[PDB]
Amino acid sequence: RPKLDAMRAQFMLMLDMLRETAQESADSMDANYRWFHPAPTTLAAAVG
């Protein structure tokens, strides 16, 4: 049991590192898309 539980924990932390990498990628995609595609309400900037 203890060795297996250590292996589990280790794998899970690796998966967390991947998840945060996905998070930062998704944040970049979000910022890009909303820059190209503002919400209709926000279009009242109308300049620049």
Partner: protein, 462 residues
């Protein structure tokens, strides 16, 4: 049609405008922005700018945005109101997801609540050592009440001097932070063992001489800490009020041999007089040029800003907050004194018992005057609380030692019905609206409660 004159504020300038009272906000917001930008540009002030994606919006000064699809009328914008113009930053973004339950729990809690921190930890330690030293001082007072030993007074003196020197060293060395309230807590905590140490040096059986000596020295120390520190002054104001009354009672029991009832009725009279005098006295105490450590609201105004100019507004603000704190401390001290005297008067097994219940009712109404009259939330709540506590204290003072179902049923019934009436006056009554005439008549009735106290004060004195 109707029009609302309102002063809008935008980019550190307030401008009075006359607005169509029932055009929707969506209609007027754009040319209002154009007019504001024109006025700012005319003033040489940098105009408003749309910081990225977002929208221009108007808020009440409390912060809530107005309904753009709705007019001023149906959202209760009246004449003489004020509005705050803003460009609201865009809210929308990707709604993130953490699929694993454990990591989602951990990240949500960590994001949304506050951990323990050493800043908090030092305050907790100060609070717990304050509680400990009050237990120790009260315990030594209990022992000297029970036993005639001279030896408790050295223990009280030594613990007092240790904690007072520690508080002084913390206040001197670590004055640089608003966590000097650790020192304030220790000083408040350590004045009490000093008071019981001085009180326990009075020889013979414990009583009035010990009481007058301890309360006098504790009130004197509480008066000194005003001029030397000037911090956390409401609690010291309440304490010096209580010590002034207790010292007046102790001198009345030593210089004279007056009865307890005479003194309690004197104390009640002093209370209702002081309630009448308290706001004026507070405005006096507002300007005693004590040291100028700012309080929380004043600090958090000062962080947002840099008889004329800044020093005038700063003096005005500090003066007003010192007034508010003194007034609140005074009212709390009077509230305690009022309930303790009414509790002391209403013994059930006395022949005159009907009279102090009238004194209770008159004081109850008189206090409710001030409660409806005084502006600060926590002062109105103070007055209401003490007024209720009058009734509760006299009720229990009867029903505990008067072993009868009659008084029990009477007390418990009024004890549940009376606060429900007190609630009812605002819960069902629409926004507590009454006519000004009816209000003034209620003010007359609870004023007409006062002048019966004067002859009753004479009659219970003799």
């Amino acid at each position: 049609p109707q029009a609302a004159v309102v002063a809008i504020m935008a980019a550190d300038v307030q401008i009075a405008v006359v607005l169509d009272a029932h055009a929707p906000i969506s209609v007027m917001i754009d040319p209002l922005l154009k007019v504001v930008n024109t006025r700012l540009r005319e003033l040489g002030v940098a105009p408003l700018e749309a910081k990225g994606r977002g929208r221009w919006m108007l808020c009440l000064v409390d912060g809530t945005p107005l309904r753009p699809n709705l007019s001023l009328t149906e959202q209760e914008v009246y004449d003489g109101d004020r509005l705050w113009l803003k460009f609201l930053e865009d809210t929308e973004h990707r709604s993130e997801v953490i699929e694993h339950i454990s990591t989602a729990v951990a990240t949500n809690l960590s994001k949304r609540f506050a951990p323990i921190d050493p800043v908090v930890a030092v305050q907790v330690g100060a609070t717990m050592v304050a509680v400990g030293v009050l237990l120790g001082s009260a315990l030594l007072g209990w022992w000297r009440w029970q036993h005639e030993s001279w030896l408790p007074a050295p223990f009280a003196a030594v613990i007092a001097v240790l904690v007072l020197t520690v508080a002084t060293m913390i206040l001197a060395r670590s004055k640089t932070v608003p966590d000097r309230r650790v020192g304030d807590i220790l000083l408040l905590s350590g004045l009490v063992p000093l008071a019981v140490a001085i009180a326990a040096t009075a020889p013979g059986p414990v009583g009035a001489p010990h009481a007058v000596l301890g309360f006098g020295v504790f009130g004197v120390a509480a008066m000194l800490v005003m001029r030397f520190t000037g911090r956390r002054l409401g609690v010291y104001t309440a304490l010096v009020t209580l010590c002034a009354a207790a010292t007046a009672a102790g001198l009345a029991r030593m210089v004279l041999l007056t009865s307890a009832v005479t003194l309690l009725t004197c104390v009640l009279l002093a209370c209702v007089l002081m309630y009448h005098g308290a706001p004026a006295l507070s405005r006096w105490l507002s300007g005693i040029r004590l040291p100028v450590f700012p309080s929380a609201t004043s600090r958090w105004v000062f962080e947002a800003r840099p008889l004329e100019g800044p020093a005038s507004v700063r003096d005005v603000l500090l003066r007003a907050e010192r007034a508010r704190s003194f007034l609140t401390g005074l009212l709390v001290g009077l509230g305690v004194l009022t309930v303790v005297c009414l509790a002391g008067l209403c013994d059930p097994h006395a022949g005159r018992r009907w009279l102090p219940l009238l004194l209770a009712a008159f004081t109850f109404g008189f206090l409710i005057l001030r409660g409806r009259s005084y502006v600060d939330r926590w002062q109105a709540i103070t007055l209401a609380a003490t007024a209720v506590l009058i009734i509760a204290a006299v009720a229990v003072r009867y029903v505990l030692v008067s072993g009868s179902p009659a008084v029990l049923s009477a007390g418990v019934a009024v004890l549940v019905l009376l606060p429900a009436a007190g609630l009812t006056a605002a819960a069902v009554v629409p926004n507590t609206i009454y006519s000004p005439l009816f209000r003034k008549i209620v003010e007359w009735i609870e004023y007409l409660c006062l002048m019966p106290i004067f002859p009753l004060a004479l009659w219970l004195m003799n």
